[PDB]
Amino acid sequence: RYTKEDILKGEIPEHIAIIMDGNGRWAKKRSLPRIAGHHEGMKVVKRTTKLANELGVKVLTLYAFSTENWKRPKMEVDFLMKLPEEFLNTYLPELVEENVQVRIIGDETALPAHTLRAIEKAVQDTAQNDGMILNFALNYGGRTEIVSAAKSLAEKVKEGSLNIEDIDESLFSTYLMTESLQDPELLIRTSGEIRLSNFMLWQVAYSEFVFTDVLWPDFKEDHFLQALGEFQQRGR
Amino acid sequence: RYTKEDILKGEIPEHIAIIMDGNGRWAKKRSLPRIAGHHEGMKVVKRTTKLANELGVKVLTLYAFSTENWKRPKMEVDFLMKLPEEFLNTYLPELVEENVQVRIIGDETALPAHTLRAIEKAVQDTAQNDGMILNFALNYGGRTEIVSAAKSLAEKVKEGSLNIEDIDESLFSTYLMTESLQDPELLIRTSGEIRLSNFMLWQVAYSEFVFTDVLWPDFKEDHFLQALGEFQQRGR
Numbered sequence: 105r106y107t108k109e110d111i112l113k114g115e116i117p118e119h120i121a122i123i124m125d126g127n128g129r130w131a132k133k134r135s136l137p138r139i140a141g142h143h144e145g146m147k148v149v150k151r152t153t154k155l156a157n158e159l160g161v162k163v164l165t166l167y168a169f170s171t172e173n174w175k176r177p178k179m180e181v182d183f184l185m186k187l188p189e190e191f192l193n194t195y196l197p198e199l200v201e202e203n204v205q206v207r208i209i210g211d212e213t214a215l216p217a218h219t220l221r222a223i224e225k226a227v228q229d230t231a232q233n234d235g236m237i238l239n240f241a242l243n244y245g246g247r248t249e250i251v252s253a254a255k256s257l258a259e260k261v262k263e264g265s266l267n268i269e270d271i272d273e274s275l276f277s278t279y280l281m282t283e284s285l286q287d288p289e290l291l292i293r294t295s296g297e298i299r300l301s302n303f304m305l306w307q308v309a310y311s312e313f314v315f316t317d318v319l320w321p322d323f324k325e326d327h328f329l330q331a332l333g334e335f336q337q338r339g340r
Numbered sequence: 341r342y343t344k345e346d347i348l349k350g351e352i353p354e355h356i357a358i359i360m361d362g363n364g365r366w367a368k369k370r371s372l373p374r375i376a377g378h379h380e381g382m383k384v385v386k387r388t389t390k391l392a393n394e395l396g397v398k399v400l401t402l403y404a405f406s407t408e409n410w411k412r413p414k415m416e417v418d419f420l421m422k423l424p425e426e427f428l429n430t431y432l433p434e435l436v437e438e439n440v441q442v443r444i445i446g447d448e449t450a451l452p453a454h455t456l457r458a459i460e461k462a463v464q465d466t467a468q469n470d471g472m473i474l475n476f477a478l479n480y481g482g483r484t485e486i487v488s489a490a491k492s493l494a495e496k497v498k499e500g501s502l503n504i505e506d507i508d509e510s511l512f513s514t515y516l517m518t519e520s521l522q523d524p525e526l527l528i529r530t531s532g533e534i535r536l537s538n539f540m541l542w543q544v545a546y547s548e549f550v551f552t553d554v555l556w557p558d559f560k561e562d563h564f565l566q567a568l569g570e571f572q573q574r575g576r
């Protein structure tokens with residue numbers, strides 16, 4: 105068992121990445137509509153964002169909407185696409201006071217313009233902050249990301265701006281959506297699924313993984329600290 | 341609890357991939373030199389190869405030697421590099437009778453020529469078999485593999501043989517060392533480590549993962565069947 109000051113004892117991952125799964129199953133379990141659970145999960149986002157920022161986490165990356173989530177019922181998809189506005193309308197000033205930097209990774213051209221408009225004002229309103237980086241992964245997939253790196257590098261070779269022999273691992277990393285950000289030392293996934301689901305495939309080559317049966321809406325600060333306690337046990 | 345005929349009831353992954361970790365810790369636990377454990381692990385390879393082939397697994401991919409394993413003591417590295425000869429000198433005729441196809445993925449130019457010579461005769465001696473494919477991952481790393489796909493695609497674009505707009509996900513897959521092989525539906529990792537260690541990063545986008553505390557030399561047929569039982573519980 106762990107509590108907080110025992111966690112500050114040790115290493116705090118500079119970059120944590122979380123697959124926020126299990127919202128539907130949390131609402132189903134309470135005899136609630138699935139959209140209720142998405143809404144509950146929205147609170148745990150900022151509650152987790154605040155705790156990680158006190159601890160000194162420097163990048164928090166949260167998988168909000170997968171490329172494969174487009175296939176869900178249209179009423180749900182449209183509600184999920186309204187959650188960023190609702191989240192920012194509720195928490196953005198708090199995030200400004202907390203020195204947070206809001207950022208987005210994924211293919212944005214596929215979001216409704218009312219969802220994009222709201223996000224981009226968040227990014228600008230927190231641009232000149234230098235605190236913790238809050239990365240929402242929205243319409244994000246690892247294979248797409250890797251292919252678009254290859255296509256970009258290929259296009260520069262085609263134009264003569266890049267020699268093939270200068271393409272190495274580190275150069276490849278800079279054409280990923282994660283840009284120059286450091287790779288996540290710790291990946292957390294809730295809801296009892298033990299898989300990666302096409303999330304950040306390159307970037308978690310060496311990450312530690314922590315899977316929990318806890319559903320995302322139930323993922324309060326002690327579960328989060330316990331996940332950090334696991335991380336500190338991992339060697340080599 | 342599961343046994344075999346309960347496993348044939350259900351789906352058998354066409355392609356299983358295993359990270360064979362924990363040989364050193366198994367020898368340490370028995371007050372044995374670490375090279376003893378590598379040697380023990382060599383038996384469990386063919387014992388696992390036989391069981392998977394009866395079950396109808398079509399591709400077995402086993403992570404034998406990682407790119408980062410070069411940094412181990414030189415006496416151990418040289419012994420690990422002698423294991424393929426020893427393994428084939430002991431089991432290759434059995435693998436020929438069993439209709440197996442032996443294949444290798446990784447950067448081979450870095451292996452000693454006595455190790456490469458032995459492997460390549462195995463590959464040729466099983467080339468015209470059409471049974472199960474036994475893939476040893478030897479000097480293999482996912483990031484390197486992805487970069488070399490990008491460099492190959494880039495080189496064809498440079499030469500005019502490939503238009504950039506024809507690079508998509510499926511085309512990208514064909515320039516990976518796994519060629520046209522199907523992705524693994526099931527990934528198994530022994531020794532209690534919960535990470536991917538730069539193994540097959542693209543190819544396990546959607547794979548199910550099963551982690552076990554059992555060390556590889558202790559990974560007998562029931563542990564293997566129990567891992568298959570887990571796999572059959574996984575949905576969506």
Ligand SMILES: Cc1cc(N2CCCCCC2)n2ncc(-c3ccc(F)cc3)c2n1
Nearest residue numbers: 124142145146168169184187188191223240
């Ligand atoms: C689609 C979606 C779903 C979403 N959920 C909240 C719980 C996670 C699981 C899905 C439901 N959340 N939570 C926050 C955002 C968000 C996105 C962009 C941004 F700039 C600020 C916040 C979000 N976006």
Ligand SMILES: Cc1cc(N2CCCCCC2)n2ncc(-c3ccc(F)cc3)c2n1
Nearest residue numbers: 360378381382404405420423424427459476
């Ligand atoms: C380096 C190494 C280590 C190795 N171990 C046996 C147990 C796995 C963990 C490392 C020790 N095994 N086991 C079989 C091979 C092999 C490689 C190529 C081939 F064509 C046929 C067999 C092997 N190669």
